[PDB]
Design an enzyme around this catalytic site. Sequence first.
Site, PDB file in Angstrom:
ATOM      1  CG  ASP A  44      -5.764   1.122   5.380  1.00 51.49           C
ATOM      2  OD1 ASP A  44      -5.584   1.083   4.149  1.00 51.49           O
ATOM      3  OD2 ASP A  44      -6.794   0.650   5.926  1.00 51.49           O
ATOM      4  CG  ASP A  65      -1.797   1.202   1.397  1.00 44.94           C
ATOM      5  OD1 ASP A  65      -1.906   1.965   0.434  1.00 44.94           O
ATOM      6  OD2 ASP A  65      -2.478   1.323   2.466  1.00 44.94           O
ATOM      7  CE1 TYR A 114       4.606   3.854   2.481  1.00 41.54           C
ATOM      8  CE2 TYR A 114       4.239   5.305   0.638  1.00 41.54           C
ATOM      9  CZ  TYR A 114       4.463   4.050   1.107  1.00 41.54           C
ATOM     10  OH  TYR A 114       4.626   3.004   0.249  1.00 41.54           O
ATOM     11  CB  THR A 157       6.237  -0.006   0.721  1.00 44.25           C
ATOM     12  OG1 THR A 157       5.424   0.922   1.454  1.00 44.25           O
ATOM     13  CG2 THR A 157       6.201  -1.323   1.398  1.00 44.25           C
ATOM     14  CD1 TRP A 215       1.453  -4.808   5.016  1.00 42.06           C
ATOM     15  CD2 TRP A 215       2.106  -2.802   5.895  1.00 42.06           C
ATOM     16  NE1 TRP A 215       1.628  -3.980   3.973  1.00 42.06           N
ATOM     17  CE2 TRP A 215       2.021  -2.779   4.418  1.00 42.06           C
ATOM     18  CE3 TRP A 215       2.422  -1.547   6.639  1.00 42.06           C
ATOM     19  CZ2 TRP A 215       2.372  -1.554   3.752  1.00 42.06           C
ATOM     20  CZ3 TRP A 215       2.779  -0.420   5.894  1.00 42.06           C
ATOM     21  CH2 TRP A 215       2.763  -0.383   4.497  1.00 42.06           C
ATOM     22  CG  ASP A 266       5.976   1.913   5.092  1.00 38.84           C
ATOM     23  OD1 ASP A 266       5.839   1.060   4.207  1.00 38.84           O
ATOM     24  OD2 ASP A 266       5.021   2.359   5.691  1.00 38.84           O
TER      25      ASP A 266
END
Lengths: 357, 354, 125, 125, 376, 376
Positions: free
Chosen positions: D99, D26, D113, D116, D51, D70
């Site tokens: 998320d 994401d 952010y 990733t 995650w 990230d």
Amino acid sequence: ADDALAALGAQLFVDPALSRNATQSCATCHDPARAFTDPREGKAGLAVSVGDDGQSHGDRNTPTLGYAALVPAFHRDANGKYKGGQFWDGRADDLKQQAGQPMLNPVEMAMPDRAAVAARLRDDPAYRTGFEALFGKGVLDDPERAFDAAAEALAAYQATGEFSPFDSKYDRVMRGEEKFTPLEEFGYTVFITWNCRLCHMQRKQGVAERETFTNFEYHNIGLPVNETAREASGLGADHVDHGLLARPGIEDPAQSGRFKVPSLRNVAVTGPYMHNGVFTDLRTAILFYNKYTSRRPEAKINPETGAPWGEPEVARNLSLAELQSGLMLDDGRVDALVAFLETLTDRRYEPLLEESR
Amino acid sequence: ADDALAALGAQLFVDPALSRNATQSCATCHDPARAFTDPREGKAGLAVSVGDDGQSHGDRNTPTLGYAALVPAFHRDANGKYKGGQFWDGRADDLKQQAGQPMLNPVEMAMPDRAAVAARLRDDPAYRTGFEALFGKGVLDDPERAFDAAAEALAAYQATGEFSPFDSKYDRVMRGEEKFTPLEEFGYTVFITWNCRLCHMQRKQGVAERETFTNFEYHNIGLPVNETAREASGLGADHVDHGLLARPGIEDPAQSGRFKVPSLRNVAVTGPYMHNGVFTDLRTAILFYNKYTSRRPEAKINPETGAPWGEPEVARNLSLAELQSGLMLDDGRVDALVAFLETLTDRRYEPLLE
Amino acid sequence: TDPRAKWVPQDNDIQACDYWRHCSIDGNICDCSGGSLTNCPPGTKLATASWVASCYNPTDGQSYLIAYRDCCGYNVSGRCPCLNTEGELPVYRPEFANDIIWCFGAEDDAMTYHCTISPIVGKAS
Amino acid sequence: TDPRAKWVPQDNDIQACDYWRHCSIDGNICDCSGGSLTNCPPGTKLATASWVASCYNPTDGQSYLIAYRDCCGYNVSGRCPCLNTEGELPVYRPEFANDIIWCFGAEDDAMTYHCTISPIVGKAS
Amino acid sequence: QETQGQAAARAAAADLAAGQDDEPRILEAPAPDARRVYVNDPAHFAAVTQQFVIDGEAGRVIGMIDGGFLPNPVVADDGSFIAHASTVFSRIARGERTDYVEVFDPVTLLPTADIELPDAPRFLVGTYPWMTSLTPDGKTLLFYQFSPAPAVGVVDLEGKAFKRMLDVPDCYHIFPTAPDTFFMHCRDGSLAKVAFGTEGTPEITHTEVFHPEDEFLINHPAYSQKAGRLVWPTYTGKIHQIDLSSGDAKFLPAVEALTEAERADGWRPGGWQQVAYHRALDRIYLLVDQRDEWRHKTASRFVVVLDAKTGERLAKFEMGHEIDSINVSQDEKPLLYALSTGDKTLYIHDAESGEELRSVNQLGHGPQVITTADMG
Amino acid sequence: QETQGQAAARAAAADLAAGQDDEPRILEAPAPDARRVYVNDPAHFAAVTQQFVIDGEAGRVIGMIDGGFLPNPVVADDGSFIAHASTVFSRIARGERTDYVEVFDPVTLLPTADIELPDAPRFLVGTYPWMTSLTPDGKTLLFYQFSPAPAVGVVDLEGKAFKRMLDVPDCYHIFPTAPDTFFMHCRDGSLAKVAFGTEGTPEITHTEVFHPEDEFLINHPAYSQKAGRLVWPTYTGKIHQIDLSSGDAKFLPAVEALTEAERADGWRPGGWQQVAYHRALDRIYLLVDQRDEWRHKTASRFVVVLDAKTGERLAKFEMGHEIDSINVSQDEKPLLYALSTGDKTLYIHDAESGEELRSVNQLGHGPQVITTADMG
Ligand code: HEC
Ligand code: HEC
Ligand code: HEC
Ligand code: HEC
Ligand SMILES: [Ca+2]
Ligand SMILES: [Ca+2]
Ligand code: NA
Ligand code: NA
Ligand code: NA
Ligand code: NA
């Protein structure tokens, strides 16, 4: 009949019998040869005018009567601001209400009262005939009627084309009869994009039918006391001219030190400048505005004196939001503004532009 | 002959003739019924082990020998870090260099010298036979050869499948023979996403053929001195265990306090925990890590004592970038990790968990 | 649509980039972010500075000076972006230059660009 | 291109949103802003948190755990944006929830952010 | 027929022909009303973001509000203010982090407060409306924290100051029911009730477990503070309803938004703000489409409407666009708002017929969240 | 024809199959070289902005740098550092303004200096590269101030400190020629030479007037500091050239980029960075198209290449996209870079043949400025 009223006013306007010693008419201080301003020298130069007694000086500069008839009657506008009226402080609602005042002011024409004015009018058979034809039999034997009538005639005279001909170069260009020079055009552009436009244009947006380069509002731009003028007026070194707050019915201290925005028409020929005649030269009046925007040392100095401008006569209620524009006029743009403002000179005064320019 | 070397090591491993009073073998401290660790109670509980003289205690906890044969020889890896070796401070290069050290350590098996070791090997007719077959005639008559060869045999034995069977529930799950319970699977997921993975998985990315849950690196996680053990060992109140800095040839003070990351295989059955045996319960070793991340007062308390964890023995060179992860393990995640870590128990020790 | 073709003014939709008063607008039209043709949106600050242009009004055939005043102190609106350059001169003629962020004089010294208003300030010439 | 169709992994191009390792990415692929599949771009800070998902590799038939760490301390890259949610669970199962900004543990406390990375961290099961 | 740009052109041309003068000024937005709608643009994780204030009746942007990284918006149901919790850094996206709450006047849009949150405590996550929440008196804002552990921060809006963090169990989201009480959703499938009206430690109690481990409750449930109704879809479009109006959680009968035949033909909810609830009608709206089981954050092209008490299906609208989020105005004949992240457009529909009435485009880079006030 | 994403997929699969381990880490960009190219995105006046660092030869983004509001980028020609002047606010686009200069290491991209510029002195304008400029020794950055008047700020990069503002006449842009000297362009149509010490008024000398008042010189001239050549097109494609290599301005003969027939048929330059200059070939590149005379900021679809000495046209390329800005690498066999603001794409061309070789898309919201180092 409108003709007839103005034509009577025209007579009164140059009649020195409206002054106590018969030395002085409206036209002595509002001289038609000088865009209706006072060419005479006094103890403060041309800053302030001398009255009928030959020594009382005023404390304010005699303004032009050109275009004065475009100014609306004193009112509050749709944005909630005071606008219009007559005198630098708007204390007179309109031209009719203003006209009687110099007649009775002891520092000006100095007539002792309305009765004395009516007696002077009676003495002239032409006035008996002219007034009675417009106002009815016996108008001149009643002091208040006669006084009001004389004031209406003078107000009508000031509303004729003579005072507001709209024949300046600027008017010619806007009509498409000729073009600005490059420099004049640059001044026009600068005038309308810089802060000048926020105060010295009739309208906030759209186009004026009869532009007179003032929005008729009241502003304190933070001018110093004119020492020599204030001296000559005898009002006292610690007097403070409160501007609009001197109008009866205005009580709000926020109005202290604010003056009516003057029409810039004929500005090049009606020096000296501002409500107290403090600045002799037009370029200097322009430069004054740099004190609020330029960082450089020279912006603090009045180039006529070589010393700092001086503290505001009234240090509160300055129009800082408008004055502090964040941009300083360079010497090029000052030259351009001078060139533009000269284009606002009515045709008949163009020969006055020199004065060696 | 590989087979033969290791069969010889199998005999040495349980032979108490390798100790000075003949009371102890490798197997006394590395007990095969307890995943090759020491079940004997001493002055500091199970935290440290008692040598052959019946009195002397060590200062470090006896580690498992299970999966030790997977640890690479001591070296500097591609990232520039020290990695591998044997003993909690990596002072031995490999198993061969390690094996003779307990034999001669006065606090352990306590043989006076190599000659003494050789003379015990010579007293056994099977050893003369077995060693000479592998190393040549005269081997047991030269103490240095004899001692090296015994070490080599021991190292070979430890490399056999008996020590490293890969038959834990984890291994069975990864072969697709069964599944994790939901609790164990949660634990696995936590273990792999939280900071545990940065030190307790062989590879930084990718998958290991033979995962033993350590990257073989050296880290100071900021443990306190185990006071009862430090007392029993007799090294003194002013002693500092310097970890990897004790390795000869390592001199950088930045290595002080750093210890080899242990394999977590069989961790559930090899308490007490850490290099000094300081924690009895596996849950406590897990909760230690919350001292670096939780804002709660309880996280500063060792639940076994009700008192603060204690000042670190070596309060410098901590692995703070890994340890200060910014996330606290709640109790349900601690439960999960305990359930996951129990899946690393070899099949033959599953009865130890009930 | 052909970006290089001579720009054609209209007098029927102020949200479009061909509305006649936008003849030298650079940025975003304020009417699309809660202002109006001649007013700023709530929470923004109205500059007193401007660049000008003479814009031809096809409805009455007159040419008017438009003073492009910026509404400042918010990030750019992102709605109704437009860039027209009728009469637009390089930066050394700044009164006609429209890459400049004309936020001077805005309240609270706000200098970030949100959108631009298109008021008539006078007649051209 | 049917966004509601079952996502189908490929092992032939890492910058596409159907690359096998991106099954629960994401944000933005770091390879597209100067990082690589498993390294952050210059100037950004690599998180230690993540995650996870079980992603199927169509090259070898195996299912691997990918840790979505990230790269932090820069504004979002704007290159190769992707959002996949294979196995993705709601926020109360945060280990599988994407998320969240998984920037914890990054140097200098970076929590913005950028993109990733998609390293394999173990076998699925 | 006539667009707002055309009307404004017509009005401007008349004013010019009539010689009407008018002062260029900063506008005030119209009074907040039931058809005001807010759209937040998280801008796909950009460091700065925007909120658009829209008159849903005219389909007109009436104001904007700037925000930082992943801000959480709130809107007082009575129309008296709006606020957000937001995050900025000293060098764009790098440097010292400051978290703060701003409160705005809903007509001038000026900030009336700016309250620093100490120690950078906000949870940074794609935007979930109920990760930051107002108490029903408007005096407190509660925000969620994830790191180092689940916690809830208390901000006093009246005194304009941060008060404290509350420690909570392993739970998520914040549903305020009183000036001193909120509920959260726990990993174990219970709700937690947090009574916090004291500077001392809060009282925390748990409900029954109301869903099992393998039923997944989405990140965007609908909550009506005035009804105390929490409407919580699962990934399959099963809907939990919990009534918090008594102060304790009551669990209402479950309803299935989709039929069995629909669910066998691949129908599932999907999107972002997948569910909306209209209080006065007691009506649920759910974004659904045919999709793979793990395409749950993709857009949907359909909205099903159902009666909340009976579960009876009242409509199924074909939306005509790729819709990510929905909400409804709370007034009598409501609007159904349908936000497309991909189109950056808000489609404004008649909720009764489902027909598109109007739309508002250019809403930033990736708009995702629709908020309304319930002013009735 | 293997793309970079495909190559990487194969290398990663090989690594997986070989059991290769590698530590995830932060990369360093490759050494600055002649084919590195920087693309700045002013983002259509957004409060925050981005720069892309690109390997022109691979067509690969190798890095980025975040910026504030309308930052001015610079690149040291020797490849030793890059820098920018930037502007941020305490609450996104509102609140206290901070202007600053950052210097970055060109391989780690980490900031190595952050130098505050007092009293918020930057000129906020669509991005003109020569509104902020490095002296040729790299020790000083010079930036333009417009308000309250034209002025130039002096920043000491070696000592990491703002020095002072210099008073200048009504002039624009900054073309440094020595450690203490630069030229500007004045409203009157001269250039001004400004030589400054550590204190006192700078020495200001004007050149002759070199263009008339009705000839318009574009906002994006090309300047090669290493050649001391300034190449200044006008709106008609007339090009002025000024040789500053002696330390004083000498005016070269004017050339025309278009023929009298092409001009009569409506050809004019148009775009943003409309001109490029290759120092070693002494060639000029100009974006042109057929356009109305007041569409000078629109994209163009053609580039003409001319000999700078003689004015002879050497090529006219059909670019095949809407191009806003051009620049060239300064090595042999140069690349011609062609940036489409509308496409957000840098198209990378062979400068000799005009042929498109590769492109780099997704370069922000409205990318406009291409910068390269002249490292030869
Ligand atoms: C010199 C002694 C004067 C004579 C004689 C008259 N005026 Fe005058 N005028 C004079 C001054 C000093 C001022 C400004 C005074 C102040 O307090 O502001 C004026 C002003 C007017 C105005 C107002 C113009 C404006 O505000 O723009 C008008 C209309 C006016 N004067 C008319 C007027 C008439 C009709 C006179 C004969 C009756 C007359 N003035 C005489 C100085 C002198
Ligand atoms: C309102 C905030 C103003 C702005 C901006 C400018 N002017 Fe002005 N001007 C204003 C007032 C209120 C007055 C009279 C002030 C007083 O107390 O006497 C003036 C006066 C002038 C003059 C003198 C006119 C005369 O004496 O007859 C000139 C030449 C003039 N103003 C020019 C001018 C220019 C060029 C400006 C842009 C730089 C400008 N003014 C701004 C009110 C305001
Ligand atoms: C108790 C008195 C012991 C006997 C007998 C032996 N070992 Fe041991 N072992 C012991 C301790 C306390 C330690 C740790 C000591 C330290 O300084 O770190 C060890 C360690 C080993 C290791 C290294 C394992 C690892 O680092 O993970 C090996 C390979 C080892 N032990 C093997 C070994 C053999 C082969 C023995 C008989 C010759 C032997 N041990 C006896 C405690 C005791
Ligand atoms: C590197 C920074 C590590 C991280 C992160 C974690 N662990 Fe660790 N662990 C590490 C070392 C160097 C050691 C030995 C420390 C010493 O000096 O003794 C350990 C030890 C454990 C143990 C004890 C094992 C044993 O004694 O045989 C357990 C159970 C353990 N570690 C678990 C663990 C968990 C669950 C982690 C994530 C919460 C974790 N560790 C992080 C190095 C590091
Ligand atoms: Ca005068
Ligand atoms: Ca142990
Ligand atoms: Na004087
Ligand atoms: Na009064
Ligand atoms: Na102990
Ligand atoms: Na050592």
